[PDB]
Amino acid sequence: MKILADKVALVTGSGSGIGLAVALAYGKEGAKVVISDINEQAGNETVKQIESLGGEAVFFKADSSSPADNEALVGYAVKTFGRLDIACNNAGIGGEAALTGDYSLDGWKKVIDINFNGVFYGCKYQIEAMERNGGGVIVNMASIHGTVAAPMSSAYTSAKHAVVGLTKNIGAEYGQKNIRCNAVGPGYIDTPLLAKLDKEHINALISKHPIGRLGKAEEVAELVLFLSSDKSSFMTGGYYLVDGGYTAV
Amino acid sequence: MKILADKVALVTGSGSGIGLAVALAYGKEGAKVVISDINEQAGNETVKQIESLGGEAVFFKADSSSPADNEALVGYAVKTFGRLDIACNNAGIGGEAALTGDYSLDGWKKVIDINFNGVFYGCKYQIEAMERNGGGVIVNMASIHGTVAAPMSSAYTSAKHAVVGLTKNIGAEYGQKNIRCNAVGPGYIDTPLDKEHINALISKHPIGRLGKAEEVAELVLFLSSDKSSFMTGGYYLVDGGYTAV
Amino acid sequence: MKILADKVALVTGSGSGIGLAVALAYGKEGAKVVISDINEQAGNETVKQIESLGGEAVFFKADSSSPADNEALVGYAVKTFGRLDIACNNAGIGGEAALTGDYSLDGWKKVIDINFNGVFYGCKYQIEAMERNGGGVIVNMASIHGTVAAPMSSAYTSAKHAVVGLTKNIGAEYGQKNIRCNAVGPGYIDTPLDKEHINALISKHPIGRLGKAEEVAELVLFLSSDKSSFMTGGYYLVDGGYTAV
Amino acid sequence: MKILADKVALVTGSGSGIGLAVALAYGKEGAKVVISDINEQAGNETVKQIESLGGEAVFFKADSSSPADNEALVGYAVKTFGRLDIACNNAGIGGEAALTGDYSLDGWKKVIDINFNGVFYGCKYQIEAMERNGGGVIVNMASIHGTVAAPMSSAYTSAKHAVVGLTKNIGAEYGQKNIRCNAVGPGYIDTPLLAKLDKEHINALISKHPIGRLGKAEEVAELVLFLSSDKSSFMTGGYYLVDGGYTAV
Numbered sequence: 001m002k003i004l005a006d007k008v009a010l011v012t013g014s015g016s017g018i019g020l021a022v023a024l025a026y027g028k029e030g031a032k033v034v035i036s037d038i039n040e041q042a043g044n045e046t047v048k049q050i051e052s053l054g055g056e057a058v059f060f061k062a063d064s065s066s067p068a069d070n071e072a073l074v075g076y077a078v079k080t081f082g083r084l085d086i087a088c089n090n091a092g093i094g095g096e097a098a099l100t101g102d103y104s105l106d107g108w109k110k111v112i113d114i115n116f117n118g119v120f121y122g123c124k125y126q127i128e129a130m131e132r133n134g135g136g137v138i139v140n141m142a143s144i145h146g147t148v149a150a151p152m153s154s155a156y157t158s159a160k161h162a163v164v165g166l167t168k169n170i171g172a173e174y175g176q177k178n179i180r181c182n183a184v185g186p187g188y189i190d191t192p193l194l195a196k197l198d199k200e201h202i203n204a205l206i207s208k209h210p211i212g213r214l215g216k217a218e219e220v221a222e223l224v225l226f227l228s229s230d231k232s233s234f235m236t237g238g239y240y241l242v243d244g245g246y247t248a249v
Numbered sequence: 250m251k252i253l254a255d256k257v258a259l260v261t262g263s264g265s266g267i268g269l270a271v272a273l274a275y276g277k278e279g280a281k282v283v284i285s286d287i288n289e290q291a292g293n294e295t296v297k298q299i300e301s302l303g304g305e306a307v308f309f310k311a312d313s314s315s316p317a318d319n320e321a322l323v324g325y326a327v328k329t330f331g332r333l334d335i336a337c338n339n340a341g342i343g344g345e346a347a348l349t350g351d352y353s354l355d356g357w358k359k360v361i362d363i364n365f366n367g368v369f370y371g372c373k374y375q376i377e378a379m380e381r382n383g384g385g386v387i388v389n390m391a392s393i394h395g396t397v398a399a400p401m402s403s404a405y406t407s408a409k410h411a412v413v414g415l416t417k418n419i420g421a422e423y424g425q426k427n428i429r430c431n432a433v434g435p436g437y438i439d440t441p442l443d444k445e446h447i448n449a450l451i452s453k454h455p456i457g458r459l460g461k462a463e464e465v466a467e468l469v470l471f472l473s474s475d476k477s478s479f480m481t482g483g484y485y486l487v488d489g490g491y492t493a494v
Numbered sequence: 495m496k497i498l499a500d501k502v503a504l505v506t507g508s509g510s511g512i513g514l515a516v517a518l519a520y521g522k523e524g525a526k527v528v529i530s531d532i533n534e535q536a537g538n539e540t541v542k543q544i545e546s547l548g549g550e551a552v553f554f555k556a557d558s559s560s561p562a563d564n565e566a567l568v569g570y571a572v573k574t575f576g577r578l579d580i581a582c583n584n585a586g587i588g589g590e591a592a593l594t595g596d597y598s599l600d601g602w603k604k605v606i607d608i609n610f611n612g613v614f615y616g617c618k619y620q621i622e623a624m625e626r627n628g629g630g631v632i633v634n635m636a637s638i639h640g641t642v643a644a645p646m647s648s649a650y651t652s653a654k655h656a657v658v659g660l661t662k663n664i665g666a667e668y669g670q671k672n673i674r675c676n677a678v679g680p681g682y683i684d685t686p687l688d689k690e691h692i693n694a695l696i697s698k699h700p701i702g703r704l705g706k707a708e709e710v711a712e713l714v715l716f717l718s719s720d721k722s723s724f725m726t727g728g729y730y731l732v733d734g735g736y737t738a739v
Numbered sequence: 740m741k742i743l744a745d746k747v748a749l750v751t752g753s754g755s756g757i758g759l760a761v762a763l764a765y766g767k768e769g770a771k772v773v774i775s776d777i778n779e780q781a782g783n784e785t786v787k788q789i790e791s792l793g794g795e796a797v798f799f800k801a802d803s804s805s806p807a808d809n810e811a812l813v814g815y816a817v818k819t820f821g822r823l824d825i826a827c828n829n830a831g832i833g834g835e836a837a838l839t840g841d842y843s844l845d846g847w848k849k850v851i852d853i854n855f856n857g858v859f860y861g862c863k864y865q866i867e868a869m870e871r872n873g874g875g876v877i878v879n880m881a882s883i884h885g886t887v888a889a890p891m892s893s894a895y896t897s898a899k900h901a902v903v904g905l906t907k908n909i910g911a912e913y914g915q916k917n918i919r920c921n922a923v924g925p926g927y928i929d930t931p932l933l934a935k936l937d938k939e940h941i942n943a944l945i946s947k948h949p950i951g952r953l954g955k956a957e958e959v960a961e962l963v964l965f966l967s968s969d970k971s972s973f974m975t976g977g978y979y980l981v982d983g984g985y986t987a988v
């Protein structure tokens with residue numbers, strides 16, 4: 001049938017951007033989708049788009065940095081659809097731009113709490129549900145900056161590195177428990193947030209991608225979909241680039 | 250719809266093991282498939298199975314280590330089907346088992362010729378054809394041993410590292426010429442091959458089992474399709490966690 | 495001549511284990527050494543040993559996880575010796591042993607605070623001082639678990655990956671400001687810590703033994719010296735081959 | 740004493756460049772040094788410089804791509820100084836510049852034979868001598884291009900990747916045989932060959948190094964020296980960058 005038919009999938013930060021594209025891919029492939037976001041209007045709109053494709057979805061408001069919200073979100077998924085098969089830990093921020101020496105303590109803490117700690121809180125409660133329902137598959141949203149530096153964004157690079165480590169650890173630990181965990185590392189993707197950067201800055205970013213363009217959110221979602229499906233059944237603890245060659249040079 | 254419908258795909262060493270699984274997946278997804286192998290019977294058998302699923306496939310006998318054979322194989326694909334869209338460089342051998350100091354000069358050269366030089370010969374002629382076609386996609390078959398050692402198989406490990414480097418170079422070079430190149434790194438896979446050695450192998454995979462050729466083929470398919478359009482120059486493990494520890 | 499003569503060096507967690515070995519090597523090579531630790535007796539003991547070799551050393555009590563303590567430690571170094579040339583961010587803990595699903599919220603936060611956030615707090619204030627001095631060198635203590643998993647220690651593995659990322663960022667950012675930053679990745683090291691578990695650990699190192707803290711310290715020394723002048727943003731294993739397989 | 744006192748060290752391609760700098764470092768540190776190169780005049784000059792520092796050295800002409808020359812070179816080292824403790828497999832060429840599709844078959848073969856096969860031939864005969872004399876230490880000269888692409892130099896990138904694999908394999912295999920093997924990955928280094936590139940091309944290279952300059956041969960030699968000494972006794976099968984941050988971004 002459709003490759004995610006009969007599965008229940010959760011996407012954090014699915015109000016916008018990559019998370020939106022992943023939630024739509026999940027919906028189109030027959031998953032029952034739980035949308036989570038800080039922004040309710042964005043989240044409800046994602047639900048409405050999935051429903052308008054003929055999929056099934058619900059919205060639950062949660063801050064990814066809160067342990068209690070992550071626990072509650074998994075609780076809601078299981079209450080609503082009876083199980084949790086697939087989680088995409090996508091919620092994240094870019095953070096302030098400053099050299100490491102000048103990086104604010106609060107700005108640091110915020111990036112680490114959302115982009116790193118929050119991914120762990122998600123995984124922890126997701127794992128608990130997945131163990132109950134016979135296993136599952138987690139996709140953690142990392143970055144190219146999980147492996148290469150992003151000057152002026154030390155907290156982002158550090159957090160995305162930490163997500164790659166966490167992913168390896170979960171994959172290794174739950175190998176024989178039927179839970180797989182993998183990390184996706186996108187290059188620079190054309191979002192609305194990108195339209196806020198200056199055009200000169202955008203050309204420079206483009207020049208760093210051998211493919212000669214920015215990526216699209218749908219192109220990342222294709223990889224997430226794969227890694228979320230049964231097709232990727234021998235793939236766990238891995239890190240998978242979608243970067244137009246950025247890390248190849 | 251079939252994700253490779255109307256594509257022309259070539260798989261090297263597609264008479265058995267992973268290459269067979271790749272050719273079958275390509276065939277199932279509607280590609281016209283060129284099977285290449287040093288063993289005609291195996292290759293002919295692969296063609297027959299694709300035909301029995303209702304796909305289209307031809308066999309061309311070739312030694313991967315030979316530049317002329319690679320050029321002739323690609324020439325054959327373009328002549329028979331009008332173009333080349335997809336190539337999987339799969340053909341390889343394990344080589345003799347010896348410590349590096351004891352590795353025979355002839356055994357060394359044979360593994361390098363098939364597993365390293367041959368992948369380059371394939372890619373070179375594949376690229377040439379794809380540029381005439383307006384682009385294409387290559388998947389190179391590496392290994393976990395493209396990133397971690399295989400004691401007693403230094404030639405294999407070296408050649409599989411080389412394939413990763415070559416892949417990065419092609420992906421970076423042809424980014425704006427609409428050719429993508431990626432490498433797949435399988436863990437140990439259950440194929441016709443001592444049970445204590447097998448248990449030692451399984452113990453190295455956190456997933457707790459050896460992989461299946463079909464599991465490898467799924468990743469190759471994804472990487473050969475337009476779904477992977479923003480992926481190039483990358484190395485993609487299918488190893489049940491082997492390299493994560 | 496002494497390769498660190500007249501340099502001012504700070505080592506975190508230098509009351510025992512690798513940090514002690516690093517501080518001793520720094521002391522032997524003529525640095526003025528600031529010892530930091532949460533345990534005063536251990537720290538005071540380290541100072542005494544450097545003094546008995548004829549080096550110069552002071553102790554400053556600090557919790558690595560605290561931003562104020564890190565700023566005060568660096569302030570202390572600059573006040574006592576006039577400048578900061580070298581820093582080694584070594585302080586870390588192993589954390590509780592649990593599967594990720596079972597990892598306690600408090601245990602998680604403690605490991606992240608010391609091993610990840612604390613290294614950043616150290617680097618931030620160290621960088622500030624070094625820029626006033628016209629440059630400097632940082633060595634961050636990562637692990638093999640900055641690149642491969644440690645089952646039951648997900649917080650440790652995550653934090654050690656973070657340290658590698660931070661190191662890359664600092665090295666890249668301050669390349670033209672004469673500050674270098676590199677990370678060291680030790681394998682399992684013989685320190686005061688079940689013999690079957692120990693044998694399992696040794697079996698994972700191709701060299702066939704656990705490392706010694708002095709072996710780790712030698713690499714840190716090289717990376718702290720002017721001999722490593724073209725090395726920055728790099729991750730450097732000292733692991734008896736652990737990550738090569 | 741001097742850190743390589745009483746050791747016998749071999750450097751291939753020590754007539755010029757990095758190999759020259761490594762041979763001088765070895766000599767200054769009290770090693771007995773065997774210089775090998777295709778160019779006799781260059782090689783004899785290196786010997787003369789080592790002797791003028793008060794070191795001991797001899798020259799033996801060998802093509803690194805020949806198994807017989809590598810065997811003979813090790814034979815000469817052992818005949819002359821009684822043993823072989825340290826080998827630096829440095830001989831290498833840059834190769835032609837062409838896209839992979841356009842890369843010549845003969846140009847490919849030549850780069851692979853010198854930069855890769857020749858390193859194996861060296862290691863093989865070095866290992867044989869080192870096993871006889873109770874162990875030793877090999878340093879294989881790789882590149883940044885052992886891990887990242889060099890567009891237009893596919894054979895070089897491929898070969899340098901292969902050297903990293905070979906290194907890991909030797910380190911793993913001989914761990915308990917008292918032979919260590921490690922690979923050095925230099926960024927772009929100021930050689931005379933570099934003066935043959937155009938100045939615009941040189942600025943572009945510089946811009947790719949965060950440190951904001953090209954490297955010096957002496958800076959690579961310092962790392963090789965370390966990895967050749969007893970100080971690096973717990974380091975084997977590793978890959979060690981000297982790249983001014985090139986691979987960090």
Ligand SMILES: NC(=O)c1ccc[n+]([C@@H]2O[C@H](COP(=O)([O-])OP(=O)(O)OC[C@H]3O[C@@H](n4cnc5c(N)ncnc54)[C@H](O)[C@@H]3O)[C@@H](O)[C@H]2O)c1
Pocket residue numbers: 012013014015016017018019036037038039042062063064065090091092093094114141142143144185186187188189190191192193
């Ligand atoms: N170029 C790129 O956009 C790029 C590249 C690599 C990686 N990524 C990663 O992709 C992920 C998605 O980013 P995006 O580009 O789609 O950004 P975006 O800002 O378009 O989408 C982020 C979404 O996350 C939500 N969110 C933010 N903080 C949250 C929190 N605490 N709890 C819940 N929801 C929260 C936002 O409201 C928003 O809907 C992030 O993890 C980012 O690091 C993006």
Ligand SMILES: NC(=O)c1ccc[n+]([C@@H]2O[C@H](COP(=O)([O-])OP(=O)(O)OC[C@H]3O[C@@H](n4cnc5c(N)ncnc54)[C@H](O)[C@@H]3O)[C@@H](O)[C@H]2O)c1
Pocket residue numbers: 261262263264265266267268285286287288291311312313314339340341342363390391392393434435436437438439440
């Ligand atoms: N455990 C695994 O099986 C494993 C793991 C990692 C990577 N790989 C890689 O997967 C690829 C396929 O191997 P496999 O396991 O399916 O082995 P296999 O021996 O079953 O299949 C290899 C095929 O290649 C053919 N072949 C060999 N040399 C050839 C040449 N010179 N020219 C043309 N055809 C040639 C053989 O006849 C055979 O059909 C290889 O590149 C191998 O290195 C395999």
Ligand SMILES: NC(=O)c1ccc[n+]([C@@H]2O[C@H](COP(=O)([O-])OP(=O)(O)OC[C@H]3O[C@@H](n4cnc5c(N)ncnc54)[C@H](O)[C@@H]3O)[C@@H](O)[C@H]2O)c1
Pocket residue numbers: 506507508509510511512513530531532533536556557558559584585586587608635636637638679680681682683684685
């Ligand atoms: N097998 C190994 O020992 C091994 C392997 C890889 C990496 N490492 C890393 O090496 C570093 C040193 O560890 P070790 O093996 O020497 O362990 P250790 O426990 O012997 O030494 C660590 C020291 O840090 C101090 N310390 C701990 N938390 C502190 C804090 N918050 N503030 C200040 N001081 C604090 C302790 O009192 C102790 O003196 C750590 O970062 C560890 O993660 C160790």
Ligand SMILES: NC(=O)c1ccc[n+]([C@@H]2O[C@H](COP(=O)([O-])OP(=O)(O)OC[C@H]3O[C@@H](n4cnc5c(N)ncnc54)[C@H](O)[C@@H]3O)[C@@H](O)[C@H]2O)c1
Pocket residue numbers: 751752753754755756757758775776777778781801802803804829830831832833853880881882883924925926927928929930931932
């Ligand atoms: N920017 C750089 O220069 C750079 C960067 C990274 C890696 N490397 C590597 O460093 C090594 C040394 O290169 P270099 O920059 O000093 O170049 P170079 O041309 O200055 O020195 C190379 C030396 O090797 C000798 N040689 C060449 N082929 C030989 C053969 N077949 N047998 C014996 N000797 C031979 C040459 O005669 C010469 O003396 C090479 O392996 C190169 O790939 C250099």
